[PDB]
């Protein structure tokens, strides 16, 4: 179909004995201008003459009592729908680029084994495994501090927990705030020091680290990542000129939140390069035809049948040794024979895993992945400079701009942990809004990110909440939505097909440790 045209809209919003107002015609005129736009592309179709909504919302704020309001309100609904027809019927090929991120430490072999599976089936794709060459010791310095944060916590605790994690975060913040002052100072005296220089100096002075054996970890980390596809380094001239950089350095150096710096990187790299981002815990999709002859038992969850598939493929083909048969080893030999026979009747990796190939997506969209708890950015697809990718970056940029207008005042007062939290909570409660009510609540937990349970701030800043907020800005014809009011059935429009990714891997299945009440006093017993 299409959208309603000028004659049609004239029928809907007609009121007998009521002439056409100056602004009512502005809507009819722009709508007619729209349907004479076949020579134009998708992007400037979406705005140049597909706002309309603007000229419509103008009519409803001038003539608040007009009869046509009820009809034009439905007209705005047909505009959201036409945007989805635009997204689904005009698709261009996607850049054959695959993006991974490993920053802060040495890449371990399990991550390389998962990446090598994408290269073998998709031999027509560039593989970039982004790393920060200047910050290999950010994971090393994070461990050292919390290690020492417990030695000093238990030193003054001669008689529980809760009070443990409470009085531990106070120490971590002081050792954190101490390092940030050393960094901001070292960078002033010597602008030529990189992050790694400052960290091995701080780790050697205040923690007696064999710095002889530290510059070895740096040499091995680069030698490893550089011969495994690499295609990266702290390069990116367009990422460093962009406003999103000192946001990434803030989560990296001032915060030691390795993942939150990756959340900022992935969406910016997709917008500037194009391609498809994946966490290193993801595996290529399985050929949909492979195990159709092995009926799944009706007394078994769907997730179980999904992991057992990958575990079987890794048992009789051994692409990845040391992959657990943990879930496969619980079927009778009547069923394990069904897998071994099917894994015999294939002889190539691309007979088992589906390749991506010539993918295509819309210039407006950024395709996001799904699980049981909503959208998740363990897999993203976007064409270069897609309209959604720009909205997600402005959304994350806008959300951090809010975070720092209230947090940086309290950091500058250099008090302890609790006086700084009280100053920071009032500042978000001051410049608070009725729109961002759901947002500013999760913001108060920001200092505890990485060191406590029940902290959902990272999600509301540069995670799923920001992506959905960008999808709303797309579908509501606005920018800067803070309160999500899109239903789940709406967001599945930007879903990534289950046959392009394999999520139930051993790895991202092994990163579901709850760390809450189901822990109960434990882990402290480890500390001996």
């Amino acid at each position, epitope marked *: 179909m299409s959208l309603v045209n000028r004659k049609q809209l004239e029928k809907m919003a007609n009121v007998r004995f009521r002439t056409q107002e100056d602004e009512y015609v502005a809507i009819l005129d722009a709508l007619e201008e729209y349907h004479n736009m076949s020579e134009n592309t998708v992007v400037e179709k979406y705005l140049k003459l597909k706002d309309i909504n603007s000229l419509t919302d103008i009519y409803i704020d001038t003539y608040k009592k007009s009869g046509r309001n009820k009809a034009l309100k439905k007209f705005k609904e047909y505009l959201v729908t036409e945007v989805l027809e635009l997204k689904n019927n005009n698709l261009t*090929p996607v*850049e*054959k*680029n695959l993006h991974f991120v490993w920053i802060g430490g040495q890449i371990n072999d399990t991550a390389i084994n998962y990446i090598n599976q994408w290269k073998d089936v998709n031999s027509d*794709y*560039n593989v970039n495994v982004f790393y920060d060459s200047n910050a290999f010791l950010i994971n090393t310095l994070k461990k050292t501090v919390v290690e020492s944060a417990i030695n000093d916590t238990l030193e003054s605790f001669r008689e529980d927990y809760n009070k443990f994690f409470r009085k531990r975060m106070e120490i971590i913040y002081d050792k954190q705030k101490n390092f940030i002052n050393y960094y901001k100072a070292q960078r002033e005296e010597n602008p030529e020091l990189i992050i790694d220089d400052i960290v091995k100096t701080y780790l050697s002075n205040e923690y007696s680290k064999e710095i002889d054996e530290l510059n070895t970890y740096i040499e091995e980390s680069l030698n490893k990542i550089t011969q495994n596809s690499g*295609n990266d380094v702290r390069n990116f001239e367009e990422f460093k000129n962009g406003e999103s950089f000192n946001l990434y350095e803030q989560e990296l150096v001032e915060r030691w939140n390795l993942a939150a710096a990756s959340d900022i990187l992935r969406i910016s790299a997709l917008k500037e*390069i194009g391609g498809m981002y994946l966490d290193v815990d993801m595996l290529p999709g399985i050929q949909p035809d492979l195990f159709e002859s092995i009926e799944k038992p009706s007394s078994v969850t769907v997730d179980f049948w999904e992991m057992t598939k990958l575990e079987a493929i890794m048992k009789y083909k051994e692409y990845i040794p040391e992959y657990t048969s943990e879930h496969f080893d619980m079927l009778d030999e009547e069923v394990q024979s069904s897998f071994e026979s099917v894994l015999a009747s294939k002889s190539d990796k691309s007979e088992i895993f589906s*390749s991506l190939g010539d993918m*295509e997506a819309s210039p407006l969209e950024v395709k996001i992945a799904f699980n049981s708890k909503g959208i998740i950015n363990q897999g993203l697809i976007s064409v270069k400079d897609s309209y959604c990718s720009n909205l997600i970056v402005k959304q994350i940029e806008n959300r951090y701009k809010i975070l720092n207008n209230s947090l940086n005042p309290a950091i500058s007062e250099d008090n302890d942990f609790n006086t700084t939290t009280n100053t920071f909570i009032d500042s978000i409660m001051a410049e608070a809004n009725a729109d961002n009510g759901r947002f500013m609540m999760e913001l108060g937990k920001y200092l505890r990110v990485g060191f406590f349970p029940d902290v959902k701030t990272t999600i509301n800043l540069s995670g799923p909440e920001a992506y959905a907020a960008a999808y709303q800005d797309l579908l509501m014809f606005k920018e800067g939505s803070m309160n999500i009011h899109l239903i789940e059935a709406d967001l599945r429009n930007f879903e990534i097909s289950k046959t392009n990714i394999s999520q139930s891997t051993e790895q991202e299945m092994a990163s579901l440790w709850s760390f809450d009440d189901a822990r109960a006093k434990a882990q402290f017993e480890e500390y001996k």
Partner: antibody
Amino acid sequence: EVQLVESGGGLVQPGGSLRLSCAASGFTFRSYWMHWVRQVPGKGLVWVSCINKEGSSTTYADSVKGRFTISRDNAKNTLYLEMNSLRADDTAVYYCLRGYDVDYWGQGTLVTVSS
Amino acid sequence: QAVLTQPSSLSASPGASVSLTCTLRSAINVGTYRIYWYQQKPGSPPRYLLRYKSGLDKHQGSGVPSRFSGSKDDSANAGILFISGLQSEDEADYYCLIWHSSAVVFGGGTKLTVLG
């Protein structure tokens, strides 16, 4: 191991017709676009026609517009090119190649148009 | 000129390093496209080689030696094909690609003669 083997080329009267057939193996014959490219023996490469993944839209070169038709059968993993109203210009070797950003080439079948 | 233009032919001695250019006329065209390189050793069909569009949007065909590399020299709008460590097994014809107003356009071809 991706292999593409075309056939159907031979010798035709100027004005006759031919049906070239590139058969695909080793990869998912869907998932990818396809092209036809001709090379007059002893000269450069020249593009002819290109078909979608699904065969919904197609683009032809200005030389063969109207005279040529590209066709794609995703079942029988095979591509087609139907050449009508043949000139002597069309005498060349015709290759089929794979992907939007184009990767792998075929053997090439020779087509001669002489009287 | 002609959308996308290459030199006729060039020769060099084994071991030397060469750079082929695929220039493309000025105007509605710059260096924000991909450059697809191809090698056709005579008597055989072409071989995929490289794809370079940017430092992060580059590719080398499976089996292409690491001595082949591509970049783009600005100010001249041209794409480049460095071949360092030349050998007699590299004597062939070389073509580039570009996606234009839809369709896809080739270059003239460079008859590289490695005299060994």
